[PDB]
Amino acid sequence: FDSTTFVKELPAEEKLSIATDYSNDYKKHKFLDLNRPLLMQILRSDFKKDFYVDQIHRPRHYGKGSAPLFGNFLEPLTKTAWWVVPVAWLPVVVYHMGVALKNMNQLFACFLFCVGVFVWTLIEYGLHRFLFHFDDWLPESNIAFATHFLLHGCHHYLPMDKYRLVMPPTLFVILCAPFYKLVFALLPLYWAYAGFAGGLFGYVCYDECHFFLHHSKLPPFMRKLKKYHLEHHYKNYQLGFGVTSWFWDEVFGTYLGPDAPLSKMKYESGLEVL
Ligand SMILES: CCCCCCCCO[C@@H]1O[C@H](CO)[C@@H](O)[C@H](O)[C@H]1O
Ligand SMILES: CCCCCCCCO[C@@H]1O[C@H](CO)[C@@H](O)[C@H](O)[C@H]1O
Ligand SMILES: CCCCCCCCO[C@@H]1O[C@H](CO)[C@@H](O)[C@H](O)[C@H]1O
Ligand SMILES: CCCCCCCCO[C@@H]1O[C@H](CO)[C@@H](O)[C@H](O)[C@H]1O
Ligand SMILES: CCCCCCCCO[C@@H]1O[C@H](CO)[C@@H](O)[C@H](O)[C@H]1O
Ligand SMILES: CCCCCCCCO[C@@H]1O[C@H](CO)[C@@H](O)[C@H](O)[C@H]1O
Ligand SMILES: CCCCCCCCCCCCC
Ligand SMILES: CCCCCCCCCCCCC
Ligand SMILES: [Zn+2]
Ligand SMILES: [Zn+2]
Secondary structure (H helix, E strand, C coil): CCCCCCCCCCCCCHHCCCCCCCCHHHHCCCCCCCCCHHHHHHCCCCCCCHHHHHCCCCCCCCCCCCCCCCCCCHHHHCCCCCCCHHHHHHHHHHHHHHHHHHHHHHHHHHHHHHHHHHHHHHHHHHHHHHHCCHHHHHHCHHHHHHHHHHHHHHHHHHHCCCCCCCCHHHHHHHHHHHHHHHHHHCCCEEEEEEEHHHHHHHHHHHHHHHHHHHHHCHHHHHHHHHHHHHHHCCCCCCCCCCCCCCHHHHHCCCCCCCCCCCCCCECCEEEEEC
């Protein structure tokens, strides 16, 4: 019924594309007006941190279109289709791996590629849990809330916005750059080519996976990974940080089991309970 309320069990697929009534939603929760560009609305807010984090993770839906972040001529940068990630980055994967395969034992290059993929899944778990869901640990700053929003908050705010799910290359480059330098500073040159190629390939698998978890009836073997990730959205976002798998969830005890609690809804009509 109301999308802002977490559920113990996921509802129907088509209840997740029900457009939010903008006026009602603003008046009811006193948060963001979906009808107006969201970013300045955050930059110039009187939110305190606990309210922002409580509210941004209670999902809404703009409808068939995409909510405005800027509303001006910068708006194209905020829209990135699923196919953008493979076309942008798979050529980089193939170039770095191809280099390694001409200057190094190919069998060890393949092996170092695979450990790149393995390290990616750990990064995937770590970024998601500790950077993306900084949440409670956030300052009392609007610039912090806007940064959070841009990195992951928006996606929790609007799960079914098909153009605000995968990472825009502009942001990806900023995050990837320190990893690229670190790998090429530690590892022997052509080991870095093979290793980085793998980590990068793992990233592409992640975001594509992440996309199709939201916007697709998947083949059966992935169908339960879909339930798992969607529960991270509509049940508990303190758990279920793995999205290509719950491997690292199990390892670090953040698995999202079938009697996991709901997440707290601290605020209502602008005010906190108790
Ligand atoms: C100012 C440069 C344009 C910013 C576009 C804002 C759209 C934010 O896009 C976000 O990218 C994050 C990772 O980068 C992803 O984790 C989120 O799922 C996605 O919402
Ligand atoms: C990796 C190369 C991919 C080739 C392009 C795939 C065809 C794109 O297909 C697009 O999919 C969109 C899904 O959001 C639809 O909204 C568009 O109508 C459709 O044209
Ligand atoms: C590495 C890339 C793996 C992903 C390829 C999956 C291709 C899915 O196929 C696409 O699904 C889209 C759903 O958004 C539809 O809009 C497109 O019409 C369809 O071509
Ligand atoms: C590698 C190039 C693949 C191009 C993918 C085609 C998708 C973009 O083309 C169009 O973009 C429009 C945006 O308004 C969408 O509304 C359409 O559904 C889509 O087909
Ligand atoms: C980052 C891209 C690679 C992901 C690595 C982890 C993928 C694990 O994937 C899982 O493997 C299981 C095997 O027991 C299968 O049962 C599941 O269907 C599959 O989702
Ligand atoms: C790492 C890659 C993860 C994505 C793989 C699963 C994507 C499944 O995507 C599938 O694409 C099909 C072809 O158009 C569509 O018919 C299906 O509706 C869609 O589920
Ligand atoms: C492909 C991921 C982004 C790569 C960023 C490269 C950072 C610069 C590398 C060379 C260092 C110049 C000072
Ligand atoms: C053996 C070292 C592997 C290093 C892999 C680095 C992965 C780069 C992708 C980083 C993505 C940041 C979001
Ligand atoms: Zn998601
Ligand atoms: Zn999340």
